[PDB]
Amino acid sequence: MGVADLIKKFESI
Amino acid sequence: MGVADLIKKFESI
Amino acid sequence: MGVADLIKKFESI
Amino acid sequence: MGVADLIKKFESI
Amino acid sequence: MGVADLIKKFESI
Amino acid sequence: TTALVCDNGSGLVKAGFAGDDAPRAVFPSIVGRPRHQGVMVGMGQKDSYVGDEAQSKRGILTLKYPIEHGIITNWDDMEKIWHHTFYNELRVAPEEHPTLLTEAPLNPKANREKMTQIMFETFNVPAMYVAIQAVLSLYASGRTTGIVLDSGDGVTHNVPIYEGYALPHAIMRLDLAGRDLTDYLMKILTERGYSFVTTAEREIVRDIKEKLCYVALDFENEMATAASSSSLEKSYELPDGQVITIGNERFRCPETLFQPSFIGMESAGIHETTYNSIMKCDIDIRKDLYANNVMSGGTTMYPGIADRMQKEITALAPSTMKIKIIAPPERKYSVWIGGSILASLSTFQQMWITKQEYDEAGPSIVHRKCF
Amino acid sequence: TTALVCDNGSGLVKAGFAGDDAPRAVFPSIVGRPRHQGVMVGMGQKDSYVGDEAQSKRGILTLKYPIEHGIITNWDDMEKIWHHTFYNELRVAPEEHPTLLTEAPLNPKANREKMTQIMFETFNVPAMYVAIQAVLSLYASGRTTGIVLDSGDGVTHNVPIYEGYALPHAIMRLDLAGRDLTDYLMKILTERGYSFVTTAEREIVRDIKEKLCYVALDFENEMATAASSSSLEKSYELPDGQVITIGNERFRCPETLFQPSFIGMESAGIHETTYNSIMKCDIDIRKDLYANNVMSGGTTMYPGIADRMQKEITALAPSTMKIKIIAPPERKYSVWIGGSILASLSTFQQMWITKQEYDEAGPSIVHRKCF
Amino acid sequence: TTALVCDNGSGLVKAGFAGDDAPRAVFPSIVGRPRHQGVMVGMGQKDSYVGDEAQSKRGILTLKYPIEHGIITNWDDMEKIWHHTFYNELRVAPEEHPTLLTEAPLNPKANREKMTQIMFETFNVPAMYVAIQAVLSLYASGRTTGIVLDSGDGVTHNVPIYEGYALPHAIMRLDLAGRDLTDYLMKILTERGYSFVTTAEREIVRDIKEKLCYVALDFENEMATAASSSSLEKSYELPDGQVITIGNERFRCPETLFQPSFIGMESAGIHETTYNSIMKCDIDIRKDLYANNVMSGGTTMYPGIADRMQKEITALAPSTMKIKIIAPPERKYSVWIGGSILASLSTFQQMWITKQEYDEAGPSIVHRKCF
Amino acid sequence: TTALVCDNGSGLVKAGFAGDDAPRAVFPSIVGRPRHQGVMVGMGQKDSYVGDEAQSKRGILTLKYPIEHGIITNWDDMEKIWHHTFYNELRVAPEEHPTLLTEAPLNPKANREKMTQIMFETFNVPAMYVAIQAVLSLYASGRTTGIVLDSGDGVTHNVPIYEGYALPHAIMRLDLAGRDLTDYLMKILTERGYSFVTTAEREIVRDIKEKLCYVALDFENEMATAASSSSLEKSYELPDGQVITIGNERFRCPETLFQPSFIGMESAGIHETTYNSIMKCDIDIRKDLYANNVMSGGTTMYPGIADRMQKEITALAPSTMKIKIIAPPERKYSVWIGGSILASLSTFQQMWITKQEYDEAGPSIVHRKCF
Amino acid sequence: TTALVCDNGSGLVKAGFAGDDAPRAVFPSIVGRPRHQGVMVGMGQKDSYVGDEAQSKRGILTLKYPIEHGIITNWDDMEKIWHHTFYNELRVAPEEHPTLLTEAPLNPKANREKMTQIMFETFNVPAMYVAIQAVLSLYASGRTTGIVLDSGDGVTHNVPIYEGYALPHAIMRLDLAGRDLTDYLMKILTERGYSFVTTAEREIVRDIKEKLCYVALDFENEMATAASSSSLEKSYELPDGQVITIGNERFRCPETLFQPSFIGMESAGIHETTYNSIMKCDIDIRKDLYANNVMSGGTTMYPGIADRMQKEITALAPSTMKIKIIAPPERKYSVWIGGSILASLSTFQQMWITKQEYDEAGPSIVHRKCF
Ligand SMILES: Nc1ncnc2c1ncn2[C@@H]1O[C@H](COP(=O)(O)OP(=O)(O)O)[C@@H](O)[C@H]1O
Ligand SMILES: Nc1ncnc2c1ncn2[C@@H]1O[C@H](COP(=O)(O)OP(=O)(O)O)[C@@H](O)[C@H]1O
Ligand SMILES: Nc1ncnc2c1ncn2[C@@H]1O[C@H](COP(=O)(O)OP(=O)(O)O)[C@@H](O)[C@H]1O
Ligand SMILES: Nc1ncnc2c1ncn2[C@@H]1O[C@H](COP(=O)(O)OP(=O)(O)O)[C@@H](O)[C@H]1O
Ligand SMILES: [Mg+2]
Ligand SMILES: [Mg+2]
Ligand SMILES: [Mg+2]
Ligand SMILES: [Mg+2]
Ligand SMILES: [Mg+2]
């Protein structure tokens, strides 16, 4: 949920 | 304008 | 163009 | 019906 | 409470 | 079986038999009780007085209004008011005379419930209805598409009606009108040094307001006129024969309908409240509303008020659109006159609430058309 | 024994006596019922209203169409529409007046069955037929080889006819036209900040569309013109006198006939749908179809539409081939006019379905020419 | 260039150099003129006397106050008062010493105009301002959110201030305080048979009031105590050595601040006037007002007054809300002290009205902040 | 070079440095200017105040919102808001900090142009982008197929997204949410006689709403419960310590999200608006939309809202289909959190608009993704 | 050195390694490209999609087939299809894997040339052959005297073979089969009012066809059964969970193989086309052809099709003659299976065309067995 995790998720996608 | 006339007006409507 | 004229045209056909 | 059998059939023919 | 102190307070404000 | 119609105003009580052209009782909504000590045992005849008798007595009496801003705050005195209304004024036995009663919109529902409970249980009235003053004002004004502006002694409110359908969201209300204008006039007259303080002097200032006050068409021009010239000044004679002289104060008082900032209120004036209420209405409605802007009397008796309102609304609303303001001379009575019409209508009578229904639906049936 | 001819449009109802040059009823396909509370008991006269009366009332009313895309979705209101059509508009007693009715092609068969069942059982109509609007459009256009483009309020459809023979496979239909163009115009006007929301405001936007919109000959050139210059801008005045100003939006709305992508539809525009329908036709037919491309009115009233269509078809079709588009000014009425002709034809009358046949063939006889 | 600060009380005149901690002139607001015949030609030295000299002389003199209830009713004697204030007391040449002057709120505007006209034309003062006593009381009390209660010899008034913004509608004023309390004390002491009649005896009764009177916390309990026991009784010695003995009368006099019914006034006491003034204020303001209730001296010097006020306000106001009353021992001087602060402020000096401005704006500039 | 992310809500402004987990500024979207007269010259320190300071001051101040329904109607105050946001709150020099800004969909294009023009010309910001709040809400919700429901202080809107492709035709918007719910709550509380009128009292009623209000699962059952029992009643304490008691009104306020008829709007509730937006979507999309119904905070903080929505959608939509509603506790911040994510993405940075591009493409480049 | 075998169907692509019993790739002959706007920059991952991925995406995507009626009309997308087939599906480097490819008979020779040119020049395939689908169907059916009936998504064709000799004049071909049957099913389902329009909905209607449709043995008896009884009706559930109900339409769709008049074609049905093709054959051949009537899958998967065909041919052909129809359950794969057999045969390999030969005979060598 943390912002860093979402960033890393979309940058991975 | 008289009350009777207004009554007859609304009862007619 | 009048309706009667078109009627007479198709009834003739 | 198997593909190998049909192959062997036509190669025999 | 002295007048000078109140003056300095409001002039500061 | 002539129905009764009673309008309980914040400042004046108006009671009349249904189908009559005018009310018969018009006495003030006032109860008074002596502040001073009684000594002549033959003369301290009553502990309490009703508004007409109470007005003459007021010089000794303290006066209280039982209604504030269409809300009833002293039910005991209100029962006194109704008791005197039925027995002393109308000489009528309410057991046989079903009754129509009026209220401002957006009033507390408890007020209507308690009033109805009193009417049935205390007076044994056999049938009752409660009606909304704007609808009565439209019946009095002979039309079924209107926006109504009201200002009694207490409430000011704006209600739009179209083809007899009411727009509950477009309603707008100000607790202002007569009483606040009177108090502000007391303060302004204090600016000249006429110290008025007592409730009796409040009633004197009310009479001063009702006679002398007029509404400016251009407030700044009037202020400049009163500054530059005495021609606006008037004199008035107090009950003791003392003379009071008044100038700009006259128009400055009703101007505080348009500018409640002079009371310290932030709510926009009656003109902007009317315009905003029209804006709340769906777009097509607006054209017919501008054609049919109806005034419900009370404070709207002032000179110039309709012209000032028309000037303001024409400034606010788009051009190329007829803006027309309807304000008959009967506009003050017009709420009662509307009730007198409505109660008479053969179609209406099934709207009555019967004592059986009140004994069966509880109160809640009075809410049916609470609006 | 004058037959009746009734065209039930998705947006306008058109009903007329056979052999007359024009419809008599043209009122909107609209029923309205008050959203707002009634209070004036003398004025809440009706719970429902028919399209002409309902349009004036619409400012209070919610409006609903009983037809969506040539499909009838509220039979109760549709019975109201027909009842008012026969008694109030045409002043005619349907016991004596056999009736012609219209439908879009590829409609649900249940719709035709239910309409026929209502017509016989409820109205006691003695004879009926249902006719296909493209054929009526060709009778109105005096010719028996044509391709017909239609666009009412609801359906758009293309039907080819040759020597009076119809090509059922070549039919093509889009559920688009007036209503979707109006909604898209609401969204585009929202781009400028004119918030239109109510069904009344939907009707206002419909009137805006019908007056202001024109069809571009070169959409990209027009977009560049509107970006570079204000010369395309127009002003219009809403019912409340507010002024609305509109620019590129005018041509951008009807352009979404050619580019349904702006609605999010993938189906090709009316030009490509016409061309593809021509391609469905057998090769020899095509030459005569290009010579006889007939427009069935409604949305095809727009300025420029025929020139844009001619440009598109000439781009799509092979060169060295005459492409000609027939769109009389009566094109909107032309469906009704075709019905008025067809019902009059002495040859036609044996096409009638009689109440005996409906009482014996069941419904199914109405399907005979379902097309 | 030391500014002058003059507070013109209804009973005491207080004049001091700006930035000083206390006034220098504190003499009574009194002029006296001999009622008796002069015979010793060497001894009838003056036809008129100023308050300190006039007090000793009062046994021969008749005394008059030039101010009644913050209103100036003898401008000639008021000019005498100011002339003696500037030349005899402060030994200062007002040509060089710009002046701050005080007034009660809701005073007649003519009073401020006439005072200013005298100040410029008669004394040739080079710059002037007029300031509102509540604002000075807040400067003296070191805070900028307050409600101020004042009671000099004449006016009682309540003014709310929040963040230095004043609430003109929330102002409330009573013409009561010292003088009326003194007269009522004369009547009550008459109940015991001490006939005091002359204005000199009025001054004696004023001194009796100022020493002996104390404010009840529970008036009925005190009445029962004085009825049941002598322990509340005090003795005092008049200037001629006669002894006067006083009981319940002591607390009964200041109790008539809370119960003006003993004067025959109907206006609610200072506690209820404070509460109502707080209620006039917008809802959020009230919490900070209850925290900052400031007393402006004069009659609020009485013993017990602050405790009684706190008890009353806590009874009137909702529970669970801090009600706090600020009343320094300097509270009487505090109006002057506030003026002494205000005149010193570097920010203030542009607030001065200069003789040039009075020679150009006419009077009207004095109204700019009339409040 | 930390990017800035600013979400300009209709009621709250949220500004934060990219990659932070929460906004730092959360102050109200409010500017206030004193209605009351200043008198303490040292204290009338500012003519205008920003929402946090303005809230404490509100008891004197009039409050105005610069945004109405996601539209900016006072650019001067909006520049005040941003100036205070950047310098006072974030202590950041915008010359170095490129900025992301948010807007509601279907806004006027002029609003985006004017905002961008201010951002470049007034603040000299070196790079900017404008992003659509639904997309930010999906980034905050960790998924790329969603339908987003939003309700800030102003707009309510529904946007469907599938595999990161947006469906512009499926968008649906209602101008409703917090402000209209607050005003309706003011009227309902007026039904009990708690007269709230000022904008300060509007803010008090907003706090009352935010604490007390809960959403019914069965509105008629709750109405019967509140009629039959007091168990739903709550008490609350106003800033002046007065106690207010509230019953059915609590759930009746948020129920007017589902039934805008109580406002007089005809647009179907948020449940039916969601369902209709889903119906606009192509048939396959719908299944995944029902699995991913995301709430964008603001008013959707209410208790029970998600359960009521699920009940309504399951009633509206076909059976045998999973309907699932995602509403994290951060849902209010989630728009900002989405911006904080989006600005950080390495893929995103080429989406920036640079002052060069604004100086070369004119405005129009801001429209590129206007949606 | 495993040979490749690729069957390029009009609707499904089937690619498999030689000697395997089944294809490995079976994905749809589909390319899709987003019609909708991308907004999530991380998610608009591809501008184009291949049939399996494109099917899930289809709700956003527009879908196009690159083949129409065994003709290749978008070579770019066809290269996309083959590229994905070889690299993504078969994980094979075509530089080493010589390939067999299939085509309908009577195709344009340019199509075979262009396909071969692409295969050698773009993919660098070292050897190739093109084979005729009827011959593959006979290898799959284990016999060397047959008449083959084919119906893929596009072409229907009939080819007679006797002792391995082909009769080029007896070939007969119809451009009909799956796609036209699907479109006709869309129209028929429109008769009930299920409006299917998009290519995604076309794929849904294809699935409806593939499950629900069955072939009548006596079309008129089935029509009477469906008219008289609901027992033929079936329900199906669309992807959004909506329920669709279907009756006569089920058998009416495949019946339009036998009666292409329902498409508007005049060419006789597959039964009469088979009989006429048999009549083209020399008289002795016919007897053995009736014994060996082989079905090539695709649309011939329908229930009842073989029984209906046998009934029709026995009605058409002379009595006293064995008519026998061979249709294994693998009949759809049977074309690929035939290719898998043919490529394996040691005798076959000299049929390969080598890149040298294509570089020396020009194209024309591909024509050698064009048939
Ligand atoms: N000539 C007048 N000019 C202005 N106001 C007037 C005049 N005559 C009466 N009024 C005002 O009319 C008000 C009473 O109107 P009404 O509608 O009866 O109020 P309510 O119904 O609440 O008693 C009072 O405020 C009274 O001062
Ligand atoms: N001047 C105009 N320009 C464009 N469209 C128009 C104009 N006037 C009317 N229309 C459209 O014509 C349509 C009605 O045509 P009609 O053939 O009666 O439809 P229907 O038969 O389905 O009711 C409506 O969509 C209306 O908006
Ligand atoms: N506990 C709560 N219950 C209901 N509504 C709330 C609550 N807390 C805040 N709100 C509402 O949230 C809204 C502000 O949400 P926000 O998304 O910031 O709107 P905007 O972005 O338009 O400023 C206001 O209408 C406020 O009343
Ligand atoms: N159960 C079924 N019933 C009827 N038709 C079917 C069924 N399953 C698949 N089909 C049809 O098979 C056709 C595909 O067959 P195929 O021989 O692969 O054609 P092609 O080779 O031209 O792609 C499509 O038209 C599809 O609708
Ligand atoms: Mg009144
Ligand atoms: Mg039509
Ligand atoms: Mg004093
Ligand atoms: Mg928000
Ligand atoms: Mg095939």
Amino acid at H268: A
State the DSSP H helix or E strand holding residue I159, giving kind and residue range, or none if neither: strand I155-162
Strand spans (E) along chain F? 4-8, 13-17, 31-34, 49-50, 61-64, 67-68, 71-72, 99-103, 127-132, 146-151, 155-162, 165-166, 172-175, 234-237, 243-246, 293-295, 325-326, 353-354
Rg for chain E, CA atoms, rounded: 6
Q: Is G313 exposed, middle or buried (0-12, 13-18, 19+ CB in 10 A)?
A: buried
Resolution for the entry shown, Å: 3.5
Burial of J114 (0-12, 13-18, 19+ CB in 10 A): middle
CA distances from G41 to F340, F341, G49 (A): 15, 13, 17
Domains contained in chain I, CATH given: 1-27+69-134+334-367 (3.30.420.40), 28-68 (2.30.36.70), 135-181+271-333 (3.30.420.40), 182-270 (3.90.640.10)
Distance CA I340, CA I342 (A): 6
Contacting residues of I for G264, CB less than 8 Å apart: 167-170
Interface of G with C in 321-340 (CB under 8 A): 328, 330, 337, 340
Instruction: Label residue F344 exposed, middle or buried (CB < 10 Å: 0-12, 13-18, 19+).
Output: buried
Atom 15 of ligand 1 has which residue's CA nearest to it?
A: F298
**What is residue J141's three-state secondary structure?**
coil
Here the tokens at position F9 are 């105003």
Please give the structure tokens belonging to residue H270: 């200072």
Spatial separation of the C-alpha atoms in residues G354 and H3, rounded to whole Å: 113
Tokens of C7: 């009627």
Neighbour order of strands in the sheet with H353-354: H13-17, H4-8, H99-103, H127-132, H353-354
I:152-171 residues touching chain G, CB 8 A cutoff: 167-170
* Chain I 142-201, residues with CB within 8 Å of chain A CB atoms: 142, 144
At CA F188, angle to CA F184 and CA F189, rounded to 5?
115
Rounded Cα gap, residues G47 and I5, in angstroms: 54
Dihedral sign (CA I100, I103, I106, I108) = negative
Which chain F residues have a beta carbon less than 8 Å from that of G37?
165-166, 168, 371
Taking the alpha carbons of F352, F356, F357, F363 in that order, is the dihedral positive or negative?
positive
Q: Please name the residue that has the structure tokens 């999973």.
A: I322
Three-state DSSP state, I324: coil
Cβ neighbours of residue I219 closer than 8 Å, sequence gap 6 or more: I251, I255, I258, I259
Say whether the D–A interface has 3 or more Cβ pairs within 8 Å: no
Taking the CB of residue F56, how many other CB atoms lie within 10 A of it? 11
Residue with tokens 């602060």: H341
Asked whether G339 and G3 are in contact (CB, 8 A), the reply is no
Distance CA F231, CA J313 (A): 118
Chains C and G touch (3+ CB pairs under 8 A): yes
Find the I298 Cα to ligand 3 centroid distance in Å: 4
For the CA of G11, the closest atom of ligand 2 is 23
SS3 J158: strand
Work out whether strand G4-8 and strand G13-17 pair parallel, antiparallel, or are unpaired: antiparallel
- Are residues F183 and F209 in contact, defined by beta-carbon separation less than 8 angstroms? no
Q: DSSP string spanning J57-120?
A: HTTTEEEE-SEETTEE--HHHHHHHHHIIIIIIS---GGG--EEEEE-TT--HHHHHHHHHHHH
Pairing, β I61-64 against β I31-34: antiparallel
Distance (angstroms) between ligand 5 centre and the Cα of F203 equals 16
- Residue carrying the six token digits 């009621």: I11
J214-224: b or e for each residue (b if 16 or more CB lie within 10 Å)? bbbeebeebbe
Q: Which amino acid is at H291?
A: A
Cα I12 to ligand 3 centroid, rounded to whole Å: 8
Ligand 4 neighbourhood includes J299 CB (under 6 angstroms): yes
Instruction: Identify the closest residue of chain G to J188 by CA–CA distance.
Output: G106
Amino acid identity of I231? Answer: S
Contact (Cβ atoms closer than 8 angstroms) between residue H19 and residue E7: yes
Q: From ligand 5's centre to the CA of I190, what distance in Å? A: 20
Q: φ, ψ for residue G308 (rounded to 5)?
A: -60, -45
* Cβ–Cβ under 8 Å, residues J308 and J272: no
Residue spans of alpha helices (H) in chain J = 51-57, 75-83, 109-121, 133-140, 177-192, 199-212, 219-228, 249-258, 270-280, 283-290, 305-316, 334-344, 355-358
C-alpha J241, offset from chain centre: 30
Q: Which ligand is nearest to the CA of F70?
A: 1
CA dihedral of residues I141, I144, I148, I153 (deg, nearest 10): 50
Residue with tokens 């020009």: J362
| Torsion angles phi and psi, residue F106, rounded to 5 | 55, 30
CA dihedral J135, J140, J141, J145 (to 10 degrees): 20
Ligand 1: nearest atom to the Cα of F151:
17
Any idea how long chain J is? 371
* Residue J90, amino acid: L
- State the Cα–Cα distance between residues I297 and I151, nearest whole angstrom: 7
| Residue G32 host element (H or E) | strand G31-34
CB-closest option in F71, F106, F169 to I264: F169
CB atoms within 10 A of CB H163: 20
Query: I139 is written with which tokens?
Result: 């980034």
Under 8 Å between Cβ of A7 and I337: no
Question: Which residue, among I15, I13, I39, has the nearest Cα to I27 in the 3D structure?
Answer: I13
What lies within 8 Å, CB to CB, of G66 at 6+ separation is G29, G31, G72, G73, G74, G75, G77, G78, G81
Distance CA F80, CA I281 (A): 68
Helices (H), G199-322: 199-212, 219-228, 249-258, 270-280, 283-291, 305-316
The DSSP-derived string for F288-355 is HHHH-EEE--GGGGSTTHHHHHHHHHHHHS-SSS---EE--TTTTTHHHHHHHHHHH-TTTGGGPEEH
Cα–Cα distances (Å) from F144 to F133, F135, G362, in that order, read: 14, 9, 51
Q: How far apart are CA H180 and CA H168, in angstroms?
A: 26
Q: Quick check: CB of J338 below 6 Å from ligand 4?
A: no
C-beta separation of F85 from F15 below 8 A: yes
Instruction: From J56, J332, J46, J54, select the one nearest J66 (Cα to Cα).
Output: J54
What are phi and psi for residue F264, nearest 5 degrees?
A: 90, 0
Query: Is residue I118 packed enough to be buried (19+ CB in 10 Å), middle (13-18) or exposed (0-12)?
Result: middle
Lookup result for tokens 């003696």: H84
**Cross-chain residue pair G237–F320, CB shorter than 8 Å:** yes
User: CA angle, corner J164, sides to J158 and J166, nearest 5?
Assistant: 45
Q: Rounded distance, CA I11 to CA I21, Å? A: 21
